[PDB]
Amino acid sequence: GSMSSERVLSYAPAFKSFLDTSFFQELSRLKLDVLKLDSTCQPLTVNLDLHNIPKSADQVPLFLTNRSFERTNEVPLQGSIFNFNVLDEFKNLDKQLFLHQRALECWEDGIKDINKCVSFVIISFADLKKYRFYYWLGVPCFQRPSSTVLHVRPEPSLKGLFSKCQKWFDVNYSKWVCILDADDEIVNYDKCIIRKTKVLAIRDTSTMENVPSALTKNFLSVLQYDVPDLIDFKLLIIRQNEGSFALNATFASIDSNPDMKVSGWERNVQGKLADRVVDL
Numbered sequence: 001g002s003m004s005s006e007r008v009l010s011y012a013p014a015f016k017s018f019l020d021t022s023f024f025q026e027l028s029r030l031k032l033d034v035l036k037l038d039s040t041c042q043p044l045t046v047n048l049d050l051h052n053i054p055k056s057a058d059q060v061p062l063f064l065t066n067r068s069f070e071r072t073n074e075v076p077l078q079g080s081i082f083n084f085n086v087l088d089e090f091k092n093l094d095k096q097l098f099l100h101q102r103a104l105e106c107w108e109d110g111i112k113d114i115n116k117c118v119s120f121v122i123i124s125f126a127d128l129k130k131y132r133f134y135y136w137l138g139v140p141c142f143q144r145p146s147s148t149v150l151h152v153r154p155e156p157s158l159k160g161l162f163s164k165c166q167k168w169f170d171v172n173y174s175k176w177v178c179i180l181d182a183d184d185e186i187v188n189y190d191k192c193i194i195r196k197t198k199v200l201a202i203r204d205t206s207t208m209e210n211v212p213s214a215l216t217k218n219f220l221s222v223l224q225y226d227v228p229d230l231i232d233f234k235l236l237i238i239r240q241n242e243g244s245f246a247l248n249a250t251f252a253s254i255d256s257n258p259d260m261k262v263s264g265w266e267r268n269v270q271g272k273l274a275d276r277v278v279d280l
Contacts, residue, residue, distance in 0.1 A: 013214060022067075083125070090124075138264050177202055177219055
């Protein structure tokens with residue numbers, strides 16, 4: 001396209017993982033109870049603090065501790081850990097196929113309730129003999145159709161809505177999305193309202209200037225499924241800092257059973273796609 005001030009929206013990784021020693025200690029203890037199993041999936045819960053993100057950070061920290069296996073304004077995030085008791089299976093796991101499965105779960109949940117399409121997953125092998133723990137964190141982010149992108153330009157005339165959205169999100173800690181109804185009241189997402197009102201606000205987890213979390217992809221994929229003829233709409237990226245921004249948005253295709261593009265494995269310190277090792 002060539003509209004002035006228009007760009008294709010780009011994204012940032014949703015979270016940065018911090019796994020405390022206590023997480024691995026609990027993992028070790030629990031593994032001893034499942035040695036006869038080839039693999040297990042156990043639910044995890046982390047509470048996100050979107051109000052106190054370090055200035056040095058690019059996105060909200062995801063803190064995992066022993067307690068993850070079990071405050072004000074915090075946002076609960078559900079995930080799971082898949083533990084592999086056979087090293088060869090962990091090493092040879094098809095990580096694209098695996099994250100695609102996780103994304104399809106999120107998609108299936110999301111088309112029933114858009115607020116339930118967010119998760120994280122850890123894959124792990126715990127070498128209890130050597131006290132070494134190998135893992136990889138993924139956040140399933142899905143773009144469906146794979147070939148539909150979002151063109152945006154700034155819309156600062158909407159900035160007055162930011163403070164109200166901040167407060168709504170604070171109160172509604174289980175929600176990732178809200179919309180305006182026909183009379184500009186902030187309400188829960190409803191696919192029959194949004195088709196008319198065309199204003200969507202998202203609880204963002206990125207702090208990068210003008211670059212929302214990749215989770216935005218999930219919500220936009222659900223939106224397209226719910227309202228297939230939607231082209232133009234307004235998108236508010238809401239942050240609990242000073243950095244919220246509003247976008248005049250337009251779906252376009254660069255190319256009905258559309259493909260789903262999935263991504264979201266966390267990169268290592270070197271910027272590569274590889275699992276991390278913690279040696280205790």
